[PDB]
Write a protein that binds this DNA or RNA. Structure first.
Ligand SMILES: [Zn+2]
Lengths: 62, 61
DNA sequence: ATAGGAGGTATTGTGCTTATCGGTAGA
RNA sequence: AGGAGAGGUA
DNA sequence: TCTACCGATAAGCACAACTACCTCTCCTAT
């Protein structure tokens, strides 16, 4: 399951921000700071980028 | 499946079930715990008043 | 056609139909 | 096609 | 004094223990 594109609530393009979010989380950054660094002022996009689970890795492995 | 290698785990099971079922005819079968009275404790009942000693293996109640 | 000992245990619940069980009343 | 057994809806 | 039915006390026998429904699994001996 890849990151859901277009952010159903309010319709925001967030399909190309998952890699940046992972890179920010790899460093000494919290979830809130990482989401703020991606220029997201509405909590719908933050919820979409925070509640996603990476499932395609298990699909490829298994 | 138990104590399998990393390579063997990739191909096969989906790593979502711990394997508590049985394969009889292609359908998963799961046992359900059955609550049974303790056979190593003295049991006292009413109407009539009696005390019974349970049997472990042979019928020596 | 044959096969499937023997065990102390651990559904009620209402109607109905007996039997049996003494049980007095009459001649 | 008919049944038996389980999980279930209003 | 001996008949003659005549109400009580247990012992089994027979239905009744819900609607509309929807899926799955298993089944037909040897
Ligand atoms: Zn949004």
């Amino acid at each position: 399951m890849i990151i859901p594109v277009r952010c159903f609530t309010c319709g925001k393009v967030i399909g190309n921000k998952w890699d940046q979010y992972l890179d920010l989380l790899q460093l000494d950054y919290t979830e809130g700071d990482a989401l703020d660094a991606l220029q997201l002022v509405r909590y719908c996009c933050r919820r979409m980028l925070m509640t996603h689970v990476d499932l395609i890795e298990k699909l490829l492995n298994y | 499946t138990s104590e399998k290698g990393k390579e063997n785990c990739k191909k096969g099971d989906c790593a979502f079930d711990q394997g508590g079922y049985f394969v009889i005819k292609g359908a998963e079968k799961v046992f359900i715990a059955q609550e049974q009275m303790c056979t190593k404790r003295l049991w006292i009942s009413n109407s009539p008043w009696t005390v019974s000693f349970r049997s472990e293996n042979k019928r020596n109640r």
